[PDB]
Every structure is written in structure tokens, then in C-alpha cells.
Amino acid sequence: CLGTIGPVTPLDASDFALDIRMPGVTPKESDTYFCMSMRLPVDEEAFVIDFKPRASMDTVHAMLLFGCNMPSSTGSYWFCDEGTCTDKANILYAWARNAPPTRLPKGVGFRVGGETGSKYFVLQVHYGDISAFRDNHKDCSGVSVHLTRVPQPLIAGMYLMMSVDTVIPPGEKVVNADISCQYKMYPMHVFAYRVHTHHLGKVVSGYRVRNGQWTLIGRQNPQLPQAFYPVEHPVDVTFGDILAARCVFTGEGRTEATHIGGTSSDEMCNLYIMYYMEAKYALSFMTCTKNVAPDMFRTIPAEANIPIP
């Protein structure tokens, strides 16, 4: 936080590192999410290929890195409750304390810059428990990013699944939020995933369904750290398969109905599926906001319901 490392350190011929650090912030209460931005130094296309977390051990619980064109603020920093990005927050990295970080496979890179690519990174740093004192304590937590202009042969992106149609009535023991779209692109290979809900979430499970056979992509309690969990053996998703996902909620202790689709006195059901695709057929993001094949869930594997506390 009195370091001298610089915002751009050119590496070999065609690479560079970007040090994305909080500008000396001071978290005052616990559970605080501060956000900041770095613009890419290049207008042309570029490939994020590695990450080094540089977090203050003492207090930082989680870190997220996003790629987007419109950060919710132009200030040196802001509370992330304001928003992350005004446009798509294309999530690229998540670090949790104790979580394994998930390393990109050799030759996989996120595509940024140029025409489609995100022009800004937005870093989100989550501070759990501050101590009482620490007079004026400045913190410069963040991440360094390895960019290269050398074209990568595998491109990574995010397939996002979200539920927006389903209500949790109060006191209802167990409620299933279900999500499914047909896949219609060139092949993706899912190598990681992260889940997200708020406090009524019990388990999130993601599948590839091919000719009525379910293959597990990943499965997790969303009350654990929302880092990216690795997929033991990467699952290939190809044309005509179906992605299906099930969030299990409860409505216990809840007074009125709770809606799964935004705000804060709301719930959410998101599965972030991180993939790669051969560069020439690739795209950086895909979304599913529907349940096209709802009856299919009568055959969901039993593992999808058994909780993982």
C-alpha cells in the first residue's frame, strides 16, 4: 500500500501485467464491498491469461473481477451496493480465502478489448470482519492480471443461468427453482463454476442433459464461499444438448412470499458456468433465463436434491 509497482509493467515482447489495487480504502463496518475500475491500456484485442491475488490476509474474505464497458462509477472507489457495472458485469475471476483459486488451462484466455471485448475491469473486494481499532488503516487489496496480445487458441467465457419466474411462499419447507435452455453454439468445455443465491438457498446443481442422460457439471451449497469451484473432468456441451440447473430454497422463518429475481429483500438463483471454446468459433458470454423443458426435471438425478451442508 506504499508499493511502487506501477499500473502497467510490460513483460516480454507482447505481454503485460496490470496491477489492480484498491486506492487506500478504509472499511468501517463489517461485511463491506468496495468496488473500483481499471480501463484497459490498449484499444485493440487482448487476452487475460493469469491472475495473482494480492489480498490483505487480515480481513479480506472475497475478491471478484469483472469485465464490462460501463462501471457504475468513475470515482476512485465506491460501495458495490451502488452497482458493479451499469451494463453486463461479465465475471472473470473470484477469490475466496481458503478456496482453491482455479487456474486457467494452458492456452485458455479471456478476450477483452477491440470491438466486442470489455474495455474496463471492475474489481470487487469483500471485507468481512474488521477489528475495532486500526487508526486510519489504508488497504490496497486487489489482483494482478496477466494480459497478452498473442492470440490464444482456446477462449474462455461465462455461460450464465438465472431463474426469474419462481416464488418461495412463506414457510414452505422446500422450493425448487428450475432453469433450462437448448444449447445451439459450437462446443464449450466447462472447466469451472460458481453458484449464487441469498440466505434461503440450500444447494445449487448444474447439468448437461444429452439424449435424456444427465451429466453433472457442478453442485454446491451457495452459503459457502462463492469462489469458482473446479470441475474434476471438464464437461463438453455441444449443439442440441440442454443445460439444466436447480436451486433448492426454503421459505422457513420467512413472513411473506420471496421472489427469485433481483433487489435485496429478494432471492437470486444464478449458476455461473465458466468454459472455453476453440478461438474461431468462440464467444465470451451466453445466458439462459428460462425453463424451456420443465417436464424433464421429473427425471433429474436424486443427487440434485440431497443437501450438501
Q: Name the segment binding Cu ion (CB under 5 A); options: 19-27, 120-128, 137-145, 261-269.
A: 261-269
136 versus 263: smaller Cβ distance to Cu ion: 263
Q: By CB under 5 A, is residue 161 in contact with Cu ion? A: no
Cα 265–268–269 angle (5° rounding)? Answer: 160
Q: Name the segment binding Cu ion (CB under 5 A); options: 77-85, 199-207, 262-270, 289-297.
A: 262-270
Q: Residue 157: beta bridge partners?
A: 275
Distances (CA, A) of 230 to 76, 158, 201: 33, 14, 21
Give the SS3 label for residue 295. Answer: helix
Burial label for 256, CB within 10 Å (0-12, 13-18, 19+), is exposed
- Closest residue to Cu ion: CB criterion: 268
80 versus 209: smaller Cβ distance to Cu ion: 80
Least distance from Cu ion to the Cβ atom of residue 223, Å: 13
235 versus 260: smaller Cβ distance to Cu ion: 260
At 210, give phi and psi (nearest 5°): -125, 130
Instruction: Give the whole-angstrom CA distance, residue 152 versus residue 172.
Output: 49
Least distance from Cu ion to the Cβ atom of residue 44, Å: 34
16 versus 193: smaller Cβ distance to Cu ion: 193
Instruction: Give the whole-angstrom CA distance, residue 18 versus residue 105.
Output: 20
- Classify strands 154-162 and 270-278 as parallel, antiparallel or unpaired: antiparallel
Least distance from Cu ion to the Cβ atom of residue 249, Å: 13
Measured between its terminal Cα atoms, the distance across the chain in Å is 38
Q: By CB under 5 A, is residue 62 in contact with Cu ion? A: no
Size of the site for Cu ion (CB under 5 A): 1
Least distance from Cu ion to the Cβ atom of residue 68, Å: 17
88 versus 189: smaller Cβ distance to Cu ion: 88
Least distance from Cu ion to the Cβ atom of residue 247, Å: 12
Q: Which three cell numbers stand for residue 112?
A: 477483452
Q: By CB under 5 A, is residue 268 in contact with Cu ion? A: yes
Q: Are 293 and 180 in contact (CB under 8 A)?
A: yes
Binding residues vs Cu ion (CB under 5 A): 268
